């Protein structure tokens, strides 16, 4: 009930890359793990206790579509140890390797994603950073979602307060999240919005706003409700019941978006009618 890895236990190896809130190295620790060196290297004791409290809840998560959260360390610097995944992320497949899946397997990717998300929300866990970068395709089969939760090692702390400096990639952020002016922006429906964008990735093979090449323009227009994913770009072979679902997740007003229990049901229903 005090999950803390000491020093000399983790064989830190090759540098892999950095993201919204840390840099990732391939380590060893009773097998290959993922060592994410958080960007809050000097954490305040009020911050540090809330991080411990959150790791406690992430440690009690076990689901076929969730990446195993193993614990943390603080000896060299504050870090995170999670299951290492072979094979590329869904972002790699769709936008780098340009893998050619069939609509069956595309829909299957959507289903297991909604499966794991439903488990996370069932345990009252807001992902806060759902994107195709955080969805790995383990052995070209099962979907595994990582980088979930961790609200406390995102956004610097003052001394006892915390205010999410909007960080992450802006393409998956719900408009209410963009604006950051609604007390608690990150919600179950903000994840649903993110999941909507991932649907857009699956169904169009493109990222959203393909014609816009100004980061701050997206931020402003999406936040003001002026910009919305051009659903015209959906492939011709894509199911109608699929396009409709995508659109219900992307509603500008978060209260109109469905929750995952209903979202997951729709995907299984249209998986049959195929």
């Amino acid at each position: 009930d005090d999950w803390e890895i000491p020093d000399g236990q983790i064989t830190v190896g090759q540098r892999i890359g950095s993201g919204s809130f840390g840099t990732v190295y391939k380590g060893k620790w009773h097998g290959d793990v993922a060592v994410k060196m958080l960007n809050v290297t000097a954490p305040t004791p009020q911050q540090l206790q809330a991080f411990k409290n959150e790791v406690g809840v992430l440690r009690k998560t076990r689901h076929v579509n969730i990446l195993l959260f193993m614990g943390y360390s603080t000896k060299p610097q504050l870090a995170i140890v999670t299951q290492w995944c072979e094979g590329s992320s869904l972002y790699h497949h769709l936008h780098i390797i340009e893998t050619k899946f069939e609509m069956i397997k595309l829909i299957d990717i959507a289903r297991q994603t909604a499966q794991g998300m439903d488990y996370l929300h069932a345990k009252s866990i807001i992902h806060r950073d759902l994107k195709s970068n955080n969805i790995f395709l383990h052995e070209d089969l099962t979907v595994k979602i990582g980088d979930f939760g961790l609200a406390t090692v995102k956004s610097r702390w003052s001394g006892s307060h915390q205010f999410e400096q909007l960080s992450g990639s802006i393409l998956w952020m719900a408009p209410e999240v963009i604006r950051m002016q609604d007390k608690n922006p990150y919600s179950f429906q903000s994840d649903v919005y993110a999941f909507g964008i991932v649907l857009y990735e699956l169904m169009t093979g493109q990222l959203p706003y393909s014609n816009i090449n100004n980061r701050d323009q997206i931020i402003f227009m999406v936040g003001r409700g002026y910009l919305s994913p051009d659903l015209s770009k959906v492939r011709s072979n894509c199911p109608k019941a699929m396009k409709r679902l995508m659109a219900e997740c992307l509603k500008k007003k978060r209260d109109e978006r469905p929750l995952f229990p209903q979202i997951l049901a729709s995907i299984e229903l249209l998986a049959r009618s195929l």
Partner: protein
């Protein structure tokens, strides 16, 4: 150009010829110069020619087709040869990162100089404005490309008193790739770009003004300084962008700076792009005519500020 500039321009082309194909093994890493939200820059030695250059490394996760197009589009930089544009030696790809190799500027970016200096003097910001205007001009005429990213961190300076531009949008595919970056903390984007698209050189000129005010006061000027923070002479990214669009433009304090300088920045920061001054106007504005006449020692002021020898 005059004589001291034609000398230095032709002197660069000579050292550039001693450089052939750029490989990753030909470089020895000296020190890191800086980093941003999408790049890191090292001072490096090119072993085949002993030259010292700056090497920007961009790690992008893009498909190879797009990546190869970016390298191709960057090779236009072998044609930009002005005393107001940073030198370009080559660009290539290797070990999963794009390298842009450019000439070293031992003063660094004006963003760095501003931290060391606190505030920058109007007599110095005069000479800086001259160069940024002349650099935007050379880009607008001889190449019909627009910067699209004017800010203090992209204006470079050196011990020979030069003031050069860099990081100007020559490769659109790179720009579009960098669009899927994480949010920054602050913006220099004109209010029309935040709402639509580039409006010719005018939307760069806004950026120049917002940089001038930041450098002149020592603080990013959105939102404008408090009533008593100013006599002492954190907003969300979206709110700043809403501020830039739907609130009056920032200005300089009325007492501290000349009226020519206050007008210069005000003409630059007009929210309507068309009413906003263009290069032809600024080039013959009062503040520029005066600041071009003054014989300021920029090299000396730079080396004193950093702490270097004369």
């Amino acid at each position: 150009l005059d004589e001291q500039q034609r000398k230095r321009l032709e002197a660069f082309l000579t050292q550039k010829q001693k450089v052939g194909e750029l490989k990753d093994d030909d470089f020895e890493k000296i020190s890191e110069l800086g980093a941003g939200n999408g790049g890191v820059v090292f001072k490096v030695s090119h072993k085949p020619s002993g030259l010292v250059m700056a090497r920007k490394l961009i790690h992008l996760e893009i498909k190879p087709a797009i990546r190869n197009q970016i390298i191709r589009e960057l090779q236009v930089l072998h044609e930009c040869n002005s005393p107001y544009i940073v030198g370009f030696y080559g660009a290539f790809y290797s070990d999963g990162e794009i390298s842009i190799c450019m000439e070293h500027m031992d003063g660094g970016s004006l963003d760095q100089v501003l931290k060391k200096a606190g505030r920058i003097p109007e007599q110095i910001l005069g000479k800086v404005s001259i160069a940024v205007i002349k650099g935007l001009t050379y880009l607008r005429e001889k190449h019909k490309i627009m910067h699209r990213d004017v800010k203090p961190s992209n204006i470079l300076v050196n011990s020979r008193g030069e003031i050069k531009l860099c990081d100007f949008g020559v490769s659109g595919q790179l720009i579009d790739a960098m669009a899927n970056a994480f949010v920054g903390t602050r913006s220099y984007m004109s209010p029309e770009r935040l709402q639509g698209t580039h409006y010719s050189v005018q939307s760069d000129i806004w950026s120049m003004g917002l940089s001038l005010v930041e450098m002149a006061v020592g603080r990013y000027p959105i939102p404008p300084p408090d009533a008593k923070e100013l006599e002492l002479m954190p907003m969300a990214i979206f709110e700043l962008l809403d501020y830039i669009v739907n609130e009056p433009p920032p200005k300089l304090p009325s007492g501290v700076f000349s009226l020519e300088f206050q007008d210069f920045v005000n003409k630059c920061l007009i929210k309507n792009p068309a009413e906003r001054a263009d290069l032809k106007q600024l080039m013959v504005h009062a503040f520029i005519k005066r600041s071009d006449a003054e014989e300021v020692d920029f090299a000396g002021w730079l080396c004193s500020t950093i702490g270097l020898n004369q």
